[PDB]
């Protein structure tokens, strides 16, 4: 039944996961792309899958980490998923006041599991 609202920080490793994004594009998800730490623009297929159901507004490009963590704060989604290994503290000490459930994982099973519920 009920998937939880999600804030997903789309660094390289997360963009690389084998996820059928058409399936979650409709849900209450937000994709925060750190242009600072991505070598350019986000993968085509991903943008194409949100675009196909007009959920393109759920992809947000962030020119800075501070700016990105300000977005996480303001949106307040239940989960926050990231892999802090694409950035090396990474997660501001603050984040647990605005967010219920942080997953910071390196492991493919864990990231896929929480995104797909």
């Amino acid at each position: 039944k009920a998937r939880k609202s999600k804030c997903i920080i789309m660094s390289k490793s997360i963009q690389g996961l084998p996820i059928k994004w058409e399936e979650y594009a409709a849900d209450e998800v937000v994709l925060l792309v750190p242009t600072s730490h991505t070598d350019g623009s986000m993968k085509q297929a991903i943008g194409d899958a949100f675009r196909k159901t007009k959920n393109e507004h759920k992809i947000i490009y962030c020119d800075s980490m501070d700016g990105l963590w300000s977005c996480v704060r303001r949106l307040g989604k239940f989960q926050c998923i990231l892999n802090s290994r694409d950035f090396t503290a990474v997660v501001p000490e603050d984040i647990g006041r605005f967010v219920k459930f942080v997953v910071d994982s390196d492991v493919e099973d864990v990231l896929i599991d929480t995104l797909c519920n």
């Binding site: 937000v30 242009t35 507004h57 759920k58 992809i59 947000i60 490009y61 962030c62 020119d63 800075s64 501070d66 700016g67 990105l68 300000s70 977005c71 704060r73 303001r74 949106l75």
Partner: protein
């Protein structure tokens, strides 16, 4: 007053209807800016509502906002109290959850009894073009623009507005 407030506001009511009834941009400088401005219930000219459109070239483009206007019984000696609806916009100078607005021309020091509702609603619109994120009601939206992250600023606002139509 409750006398001179009421006559002032009835003058304004006429000017407003005459102004907004036109699609000619000399009589109506507010075309596509202020869509409508009227008192919520005509027996009570102390409460008004307005609809504005987001200024062009901002992330408020192509969306409307409803604004509430309370005229105190001491108008036009004191400014109206103006706010957005709760959870209806995200702006440095708006406390989103209450709709409270920080607008300078509404402050004791700066207010002139010469300014009217039209000038107050226009100034609110002007605020969506020109934020003052240095003393912010919304400190997270303030922190974005104070870090120049324009991609995050336009994305979050568009995210918010699109998701509000849903």
């Amino acid at each position: 007053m409750a006398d001179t407030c009421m006559s002032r506001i009835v003058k304004e009511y006429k000017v407003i209807l005459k102004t907004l009834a036109s699609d000619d941009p000399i009589a109506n400088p507010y075309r596509g800016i202020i869509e409508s401005l009227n008192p919520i219930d005509e027996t009570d000219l102390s409460k008004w509502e307005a609809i504005i459109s987001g200024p062009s070239d901002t992330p408020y483009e192509n969306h409307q906002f409803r604004i509430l206007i309370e005229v105190p019984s001491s108008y036009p000696m004191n400014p109206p109290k103006i706010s957005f609806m709760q959870n209806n916009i995200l702006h440095c100078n708006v406390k989103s959850a209450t709709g409270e607005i920080c607008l300078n021309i509404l402050k004791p020091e700066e207010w002139t009894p010469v300014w009217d509702l039209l000038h107050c609603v226009h100034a609110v619109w002007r605020l969506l073009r020109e934020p003052v994120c240095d003393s912010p009601l919304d400190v997270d939206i303030g922190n974005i623009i104070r870090c120049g992250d324009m991609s995050a600023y336009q994305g979050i606002v568009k995210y918010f507005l699109a998701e509000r139509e849903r």
